[PDB]
């Protein structure tokens, strides 16, 4: 049983979680849910053994192995696919690193004859012969080509190369699996495959995610990272929901009862205890208030970001006009001669399903030049806000959080406004002093909203605006973005968001481009799919 004792990690000024001591394993699957800025990923890489915790320890049996899904894409670009998907079993890979390095220099002397001769028995007893073809029909299950998965790791297009890293996680038949944010920005069919395959093997995966479906399919227990503690609720996602809600509501009712019978007692203590001839009748109750002692209540970490988008100078008639749209890089033109026109106030839901130009069209519209389209045009007083799916480049800088937000304080906005626009986002001056590139995916996404607020743009463009974001920071978007009076072009990969937010629909089919007016419900009825 992989066990952890009294971790108490402190990042900056307040512990994300303190004195956690818990056992894991036993062949169960544990969800790891919590609020978007609750340090769950920090706990995960503490548990794996990457970074040492502030306090306490984490012990795992040395023979039993861990497999963690890392986000370091193109960290393996130098060498090919079929060995980078194998090198995730570190014990059998150093074997090859020694086998293919000792051999080269001539010749196999009488230290080779016993350092490399019985090195191949390590290959045999780690099953090195059935390595590629056991990983071949795992990379094929993922969907990284079918027979072409080979050559330099730069050969596979960076659109979906991270599926190699995903398949690297469970190839080794690992007991402990620690997949972290497994299916962010990912499709649905390969998610179906992952859900079906995860529970085929008998391991002890700890899975951190925010969608209900994945957790319910592949979970057996859940852990929270709320209120600075993880307490394990057995069951499923709905079971955790009902358990947490019921327990918190009963606590906030026990509190009511204790408050009532403390206030009534204190009333008597205040009336008496100063009377000249009845003073000693308040002291049988002064000592009884000292025995009720309502239990500590800690603020829930969920919260709600008060996101409010406001236009600066509204525009009229056509927002944009685009004609000539044709562009292709390797396979051919993803979209050929696409014509659309957007009136002001329109909302577009341009969904693509994993690699049809669903993001590069938005990149062209915001400006990524050299298309065949010669008639892309914006409105005149147009101000554009952009949410690209890659938040890494905007944070590849050593700027602190607040000063980074202060790149765009408009003429009239001060320290007070630039800091209230993130205080509104429940960011603390506690965290105002930290470097920008150290924030989680959801925290970076919300900071990007804190930047979208400043420009007050009359056009909004979002490319999967909800990614690594929890339930509440998606609900705030659903209830704030709908009250925005400017133009909106977005692509939410999920279904409920587009069905409840769309006004017009425009998807790039792998050979052509569609167009339709009416939300995703009516589009679903037109398609025939329920």
């Amino acid at each position: 049983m992989l066990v952890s004792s009294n971790v108490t990690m402190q990042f900056g000024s307040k512990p994300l979680f303190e004195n956690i001591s818990v056992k894991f394993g036993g062949g169960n699957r544990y969800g790891l849910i919590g609020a978007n800025g609750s340090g769950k990923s920090t706990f995960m890489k503490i548990l794996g053994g990457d970074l040492e915790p502030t306090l306490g320890n984490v012990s795992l049996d040395p023979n039993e192995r861990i497999g963690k899904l890392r986000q370091d894409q193109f960290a393996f670009e130098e060498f090919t696919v079929l060995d980078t998907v194998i090198m995730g079993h570190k014990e059998l890979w150093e074997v090859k690193q020694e086998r293919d390095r000792i051999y080269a220099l001539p010749e196999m002397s009488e230290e080779d004859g016993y350092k490399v001769a019985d090195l191949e028995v390590k290959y045999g007893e780690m099953d090195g012969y059935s390595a590629e073809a056991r990983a071949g029909e795992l990379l094929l299950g993922v969907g990284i080509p079918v027979e072409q998965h080979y050559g330099p790791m730069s050969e596979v297009a960076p659109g979906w190369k991270l599926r190699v890293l995903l398949a690297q996680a469970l190839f080794a038949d690992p007991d402990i699996l620690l997949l972290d944010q497994p299916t962010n920005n990912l499709d649905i069919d390969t998610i179906r495959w992952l859900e079906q395959v995860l529970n085929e093997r008998d391991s002890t995966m700890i899975i951190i995610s925010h969608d209900r479906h994945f957790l319910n399919m592949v979970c057996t227990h859940m852990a929270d990272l709320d209120y600075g503690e993880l307490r394990v609720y057995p069951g499923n996602y709905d079971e955790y929901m009902t358990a947490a809600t019921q327990a918190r509501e009963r606590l906030l009712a026990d509190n009511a009862k204790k408050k009532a019978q403390i206030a009534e007692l204190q009333s008597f203590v205040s009336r008496f205890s100063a009377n000249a001839s009845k003073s000693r009748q308040a002291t049988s109750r002064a000592r009884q208030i000292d025995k009720i002692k309502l239990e500590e209540v800690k603020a829930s970490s969920r919260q709600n970001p008060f996101i409010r988008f406001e236009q600066d100078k509204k525009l009229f008639r056509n927002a944009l006009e685009v004609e000539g749209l044709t562009k292709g890089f390797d396979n051919g033109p993803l979209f050929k001669n696409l014509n659309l026109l957007l009136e002001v106030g329109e909302k577009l839901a341009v969904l693509g399903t994993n690699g049809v130009g669903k993001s590069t069209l938005l990149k062209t519209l915001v400006g990524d030049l050299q298309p065949d389209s010669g008639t892309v045009k914006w409105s005149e007083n147009a101000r554009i806000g952009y949410y690209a799916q890659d938040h890494e480049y905007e944070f590849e800088n050593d700027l602190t959080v607040f000063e980074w937000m202060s790149q765009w304080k408009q003429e009239g906005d001060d320290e007070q406004a630039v800091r209230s626009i993130l205080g509104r986002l429940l960011f603390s001056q506690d965290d105002i002093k930290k470097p920008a590139k150290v924030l989680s995916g959801g925290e970076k996404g919300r900071m990007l909203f804190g930047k979208l607020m400043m420009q007050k743009p009359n056009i909004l463009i979002m490319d999967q605006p909800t990614n690594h974001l929890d339930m509440e920071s998606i609900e705030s978007l659903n209830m704030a973005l709908e009250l925005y009076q400017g133009t909106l072009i977005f692509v939410s990969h999920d279904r409920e968001f587009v069905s409840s937010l769309a006004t017009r629909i425009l998807e790039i089919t792998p050979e052509r481009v569609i167009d339709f007016s009416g939300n995703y419900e009516d589009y679903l009825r037109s398609k025939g799919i329920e």
């Binding site: 010749e107 196999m108 004859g113 001769a117 019985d118 191949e120």
Partner: protein, 220 residues
């Protein structure tokens, strides 16, 4: 059929005697064959850890009753000494790569610490069948002439299944009872010696002796 009528002829739960079991094997052997009989012993270990594996090789006192065409993978002085050792292979870079390129395999792999041609030429075939020399198994040894005796005298090798059961041929049905007895005993003793350090519990949990086509029974 035969195996619907001998299923009642042999009992599974009852543990037979060492001599009585082999007598039953000889009386159950029907199909025309040399029928090299084997024994599977359930070693009590866990395969999840590399330190508890039992990879070994030992010489039987009577022998298996068959000969193996072991290939000497050597070179230089080592590859030249094996010529008069009564082997069935020649150790050289060309005879290994090109010669073994179409060739299937040999019974054993000669120890070639002097040459540099029998290291990885096996590839998928020379390792998939476990034909590579190893120091623990004695396949990769400096005394080619001495290892010739193990190659020709029945140097039986044994390695664990991914569960922890070691099975190997103990002889042929033509062998006599008082010879098969000591033949099995020698392998059992070699396993007892080869037992690893942290092998908790009782290590020999069952000794299932059997033939190729006959039945399989316990003896102790």
């Amino acid at each position: 059929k035969r195996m619907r009528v001998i299923r009642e002829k042999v009992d599974a739960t009852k543990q037979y005697d060492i001599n009585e079991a082999i007598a039953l094997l000889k009386e159950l052997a029907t199909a025309k064959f040399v029928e090299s009989v084997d024994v599977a012993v359930n070693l009590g270990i866990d395969a999840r850890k590399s330190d508890q594996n039992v990879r070994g090789a030992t010489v039987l006192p009577h022998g298996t009753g068959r000969s193996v065409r072991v290939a000497v993978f050597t070179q230089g002085a080592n590859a030249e000494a094996a010529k008069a050792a009564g082997a069935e292979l020649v150790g050289m870079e060309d005879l290994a790569d090109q010669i073994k390129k179409g060739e299937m395999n040999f019974d054993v792999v000669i120890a070639s610490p002097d040459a540099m041609r029998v290291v990885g030429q096996l590839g998928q075939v020379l390792g998939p069948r476990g034909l590579m020399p190893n120091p623990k198994v004695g396949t990769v040894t400096p005394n080619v002439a001495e290892a010739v005796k193990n190659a020709k005298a029945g140097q039986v090798r044994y390695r664990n299944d991914k569960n922890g059961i070691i099975h190997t041929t103990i002889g042929k049905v033509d062998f006599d009872a008082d010879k098969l007895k000591e033949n099995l005993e020698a392998l059992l003793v070699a396993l007892k010696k080869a037992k690893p350090t942290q092998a908790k519990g009782v290590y020999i949990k069952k000794v299932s002796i059997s033939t190729t086509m006959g039945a399989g029974v316990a003896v102790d």
